[PDB]
Design brief:
Blueprint lengths: L3 E6 L14 H4 L7 E8 L7 E2 L10 H12 L3 E7 L16 H17 L4 E5 L6 H15 L4 E4 L17 H8 L5 E5 L11 H8 L7 E6 L10 H15 L4 E5 L14 H10 L4
Parallel strand pairs: 1-2, 1-9, 2-4, 4-5, 5-6, 6-7, 7-8, 8-9
Antiparallel strand pairs: 2-3
Helix pairs in contact: 4-5, 7-8
Bound molecules: 2-acetamido-2-deoxy-beta-D-glucopyranose (2 copies) and zinc ion (7 copies).
Length: 283
């Protein structure tokens, strides 16, 4: 059900090392959260999968995993993301390995984490180069093992869907051609210099390059701690225009939860309330 409202949840504990609850996203009024992406999972050569600084089964994450059950009860799909800023998950030592046993070993760890933590999807946020063969295999294998209703997404930077600047090495247009039916949507990063939601031009260019609006989620920084943040009012103006063109867009994702403007660390759920008013103004 479009539009999706997706929140990345990377910072899991506050400055006092206390868990940050994800539950206000379902308990505070006026939020239509569709997906919560727990991140960032890391594949480590010679190691075990980590969620940020600890293995996901560590006591550090007891509160997190307990809360995910409640999120799912409320109708939110809980996914993981592997990759992001920290290199190591998609190189020739791990998931891009040309050694079959090495690939099976690290892939098996990812598969096992998905099963053990009862995730409903996986976002492959590839921010270092990975071969075409490697990404194609990973997606096809995930699809093979987890079935057609498991969610598989990627997080291209916006220009990577416009035949331009790309963090991932492989081609997203080639990927869409060969594995597009296995990919539910693209968490498209309109920030860091790679694209802008301040007008419709970038989103329209991506659509014209063969990526359906239903599969292009407009990614947004939730704070100006980075490059390319825009006010939600600007986001709204652009989305109104896009909807007039396409009827339905893929939705919006936010990087990342805990300190989101306007409410900050005190009230980080206010972002999701505002974006819900943008995407579903009749709710
Ligand atoms: C919930 O937390 C308890 C610790 O109080 C832990 O034993 C249990 O495994 C947790 N549940 C999940 C799904 O992680
Ligand atoms: C979005 O923009 C339209 C057109 O300017 C406006 O009517 C509406 O108030 C805006 N919605 C939100 C949630 O800001
Ligand atoms: Zn460790
Ligand atoms: Zn990132
Ligand atoms: Zn990113
Ligand atoms: Zn189905
Ligand atoms: Zn396929
Ligand atoms: Zn093109
Ligand atoms: Zn407030």
């Amino acid at each position: 059900d479009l539009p999706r409202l997706i929140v990345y949840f990377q910072t899991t504990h506050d400055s006092s090392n206390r868990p940050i609850s994800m539950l206000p996203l379902i308990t505070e009024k006026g939020i239509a959260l569709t997906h919560l992406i727990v991140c960032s999972f890391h594949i480590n050569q010679g190691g075990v999968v980590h969620l940020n600084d600890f293995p996901p089964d560590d006591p550090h994450f007891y509160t997190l995993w307990n809360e995910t059950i409640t999120m799912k009860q409320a109708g939110v799909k809980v996914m993981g993301m592997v990759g992001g800023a920290a290199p190591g998950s998609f190189n020739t030592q791990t998931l891009d390995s040309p050694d079959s046993a090495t690939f099976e070993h690290y892939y098996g760890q990812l598969r096992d984490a998905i099963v053990n933590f009862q995730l409903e999807g996986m976002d492959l946020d590839v921010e270092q180069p990975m071969s075409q063969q490697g990404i194609d295999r990973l997606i096809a294998r995930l699809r093979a093992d987890f079935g057609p209703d498991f969610l598989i997404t990627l997080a291209p930077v916006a220009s990577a869907l416009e035949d331009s600047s790309n963090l991932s090495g492989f081609s997203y247009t080639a990927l869409q051609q060969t594995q597009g039916n296995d990919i539910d949507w693209y968490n498209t990063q309109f920030y860091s210099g790679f694209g802008s939601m301040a007008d419709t031009s970038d989103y329209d260019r991506i659509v014209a390059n063969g990526f359906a609006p239903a599969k292009v989620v407009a990614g947004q920084l939730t704070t100006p701690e980075g490059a390319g943040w825009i006010p939600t009012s600007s986001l709204n103006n652009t989305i109104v225009s896009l909807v007039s063109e396409y009827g339905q867009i893929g939705g919006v994702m936010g990087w990342e939860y805990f300190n989101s403007l306007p409410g900050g660390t005190a009230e980080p759920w206010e972002w999701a309330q505002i974006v819900t008013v943008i995407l579903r103004p009749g709710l």
